[PDB]
Amino acid sequence: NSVTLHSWLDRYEKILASRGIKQKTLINYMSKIKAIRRGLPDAPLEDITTKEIAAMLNGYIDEGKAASAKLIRSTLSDAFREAIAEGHITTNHVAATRAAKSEVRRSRLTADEYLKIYQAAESSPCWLRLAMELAVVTGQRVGDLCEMKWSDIVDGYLYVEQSKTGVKIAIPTALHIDALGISMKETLDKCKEILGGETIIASTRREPLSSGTVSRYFMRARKASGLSFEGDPPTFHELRSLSARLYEKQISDKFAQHLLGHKSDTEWDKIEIK
Amino acid sequence: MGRRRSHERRDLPPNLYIRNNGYYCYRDPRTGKEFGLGRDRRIAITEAIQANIELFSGHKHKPLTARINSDNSVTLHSWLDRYEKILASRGIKQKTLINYMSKIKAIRRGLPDAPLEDITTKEIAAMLNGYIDEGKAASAKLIRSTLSDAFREAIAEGHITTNHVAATRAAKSEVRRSRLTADEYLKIYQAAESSPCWLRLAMELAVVTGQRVGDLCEMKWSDIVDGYLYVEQSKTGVKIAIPTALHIDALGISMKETLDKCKEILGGETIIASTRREPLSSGTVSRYFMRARKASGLSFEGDPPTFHELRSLSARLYEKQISDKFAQHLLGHKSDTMASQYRDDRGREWDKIEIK
Amino acid sequence: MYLTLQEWNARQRRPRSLETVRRWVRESRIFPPPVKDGREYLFHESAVKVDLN
Amino acid sequence: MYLTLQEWNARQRRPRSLETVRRWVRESRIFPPPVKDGREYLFHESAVKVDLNR
Amino acid sequence: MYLTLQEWNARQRRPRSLETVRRWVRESRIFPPPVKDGREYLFHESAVKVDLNRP
């Protein structure tokens, strides 16, 4: 015999542990499995009906967390699909449901807003301002900005190894944003004088900092400025979105794509005469 | 009663028993005694069944007053009421939601409020075809499409196993609306004289820009900067910029001459206002256009043209006047599937094939 | 995983003689039915004495 | 995946004496044969008993 | 890739003694036979003990 839902979810986690994926990634799925535990009773898989699955799913959709429902529904479905592979059951009662379409409500950042936040970051340490200008001049993600060492800079270049995708690019130390008044070179040297550490962005103790504190302190200066938005207040990651939006009208669109680390393509167009 | 109902009787006929040793007996309507029938359940049951007769329609249960009950109670209308709520959470564009409700209110009036599982495919086609013979072919297509989706959500929430609506056919419906010609445009133009002034300007502005009627009565004079008319559609929501340097040589109208002709005559916050310096609904600009249509004394095949046809005629002229790549961006289109369908004639004027 | 004839009858309420229990085997009076290993029968831990008629 | 004679007898319907386990191998009553590797048989992960008779 | 005397024996179904493995090498009970390199023996990746006897 040996059935039951929970018993399977325990033998399912080990399966994903051999899939060979990122660390943080494996953790994301685990958090989804635990939610299913306290979301559905402990009984054989062949007993679980599609109704109970949608009863728990919609429960997270009404609470406002529609995005979470999508992942939990997409993860719970994979468990059953791998369960059938073992010969446990015969059908996937999760493929009968429908994922709730969620729309991104995280507002973007403009030029005026950024200037209002940078000045409000005065009460904050002396590395936040540097992290802001750097994240906008390089347009890189907060994750790699913390793993940047002064050894990466080679003859006027900036070797950056993206952790997320894995793309490898080299941003020259000649860039400059013509809208806020920031220069790549002047920004880097400003970090070598003020900060002074092994990494371009360090702490007051001359030591590397986590990527969870760089955007954390940025939030404090966000609510301290006193700016209202529509939806969810922008974050530190938005500096990356603002970076490209500026470089597209400062140089070229093909430049913003190469700066971010993209390869493929994927508002108010103009109707030319021809 | 003495024994009342018991638990074993719940699955046994009236004149049947069930001892402690899993044995069954055959009561006698003469003295009250009994004999030995069988050891099995369905066997001893069927025996007592063939003895007098079967059960009945449902269940007896008739003590003195009443008690708790928890039986089945499936219903279609009950589900529909819960379906209308789920739709309001799918993020719709107002109007579209009303369309659904208009199709749901017709189903509950054409189909019993019986259990969903009891709803056969036959009773679904009986009502469907009832609206196909009345000429309402397009209606039958929307009603079946909306009703079919209602069951897909039902299956997802543990109610039914299969959709008996995905088995029926969808009634095809060809467009009966005729197309407008340039020689017909001027005729209506002269028949709009008896009509207000804004009707002779809204018609020239809906043929020079080729914009939707709804997005034609929502354009303010502030949406015109440096000679560019920034228009944000409401249907698809695609933004565009129409230059004031556009004129049709097939009708003799300029967009810079028509625009300024709406600033003095009309005068208002909107390019196309009324006689009270106030905005005008989209479901009225077309109304006053139909009057001049019938008054002009015309004659078409099938359903007569309309104000929306001004968008079709505009693109038809913008394809021969300049190019095809021009009458594809001005309309706000991007796909390459309707660029050939919005070019058709439908059987109005023969596609004159020149040397080229 | 299984239980011997003695280990199964010893857990019963009214432990009958070996022969009698062996007879309920040939008469299929025990379901789930026991399987024969080599010389002894190994019933299931949930196997019960289904007394019918 | 190959197991020993002791580990194999532990994963059967009924664990018997090591002597009896060795007997089956000698009498060729298991598909496939263990194949002596040095001085200790190595059962296959799918090597199950068959049992004959007359 | 060539494994050593210890590495090869550490990947068998049942790890034995170093002196024991040395005995097979002399009894040709290792197919294929290891190669002499320096002072130790280098076995093949798919090297597995065999029985050169037909009773």
From Swiss-Prot, chain B:
Name of the featured protein: Integrase
Presence of keyword Transmembrane helix: no
Keywords assigned: DNA integration, DNA recombination, DNA-binding, Hydrolase, Transferase, Viral genome excision, Viral genome integration, Virus entry into host cell
The organism's taxonomic lineage, starting at the top: Viruses, Duplodnaviria, Heunggongvirae, Uroviricota, Caudoviricetes
Positions of the Tyr recombinase domain: 175-355
Active site per the UniProt annotation: 212, 235, 308, 311, 333, 342 (o-(3'-phospho-dna)-tyrosine intermediate)
Top-rank lineage group of the source organism: Viruses
Family from the record: Belongs to the 'phage' integrase family.
E.C. no: 2.7.7.-, 3.1.-.-
Known function: Integrase is necessary for integration of the phage into the host genome by site-specific recombination. In conjunction with excisionase, integrase is also necessary for excision of the prophage from the host genome.
BP term (GO), one: viral genome integration into host DNA
UniProt cross-references to PANTHER family, sorted A to Z: PROPHAGE INTEGRASE, PROPHAGE INTEGRASE INTS-RELATED
Core-binding (CB) domain ranges (all copies): 74-155
Self-association state and partner proteins as the record states: Homotetramer. Interacts (via N-terminus) with the excisionase (via C-terminus). Part of the excision complex made of the integrase tetramer, IHF, Fis and Xis.
Keyword Transferase: yes
One Gene Ontology MF term: integrase activity
From Swiss-Prot, chain D:
Superkingdom of the source species: Viruses
Transmembrane segments: none
GO MF term (any one): identical protein binding
Keywords: DNA recombination, DNA-binding, Viral genome excision
Disulphide bridges, residue numbers: none
Signal sequence extent: none
Listed GO biological process terms: DNA recombination; provirus excision
Keyword Protein biosynthesis in record: no
Subunit structure: Interacts (via C-terminus) with the integrase (via N-terminus). Part of the excision complex made of the integrase tetramer, IHF, Fis and Xis.
Function: Part of the excision complex necessary for the excision of prophage from the host genome by site-specific recombination at the att site.
Protein name in UniProt: Excisionase
Protein source organism: Escherichia phage lambda
Gene: xis
Full-protein interval shown: 1 to 54 of 72
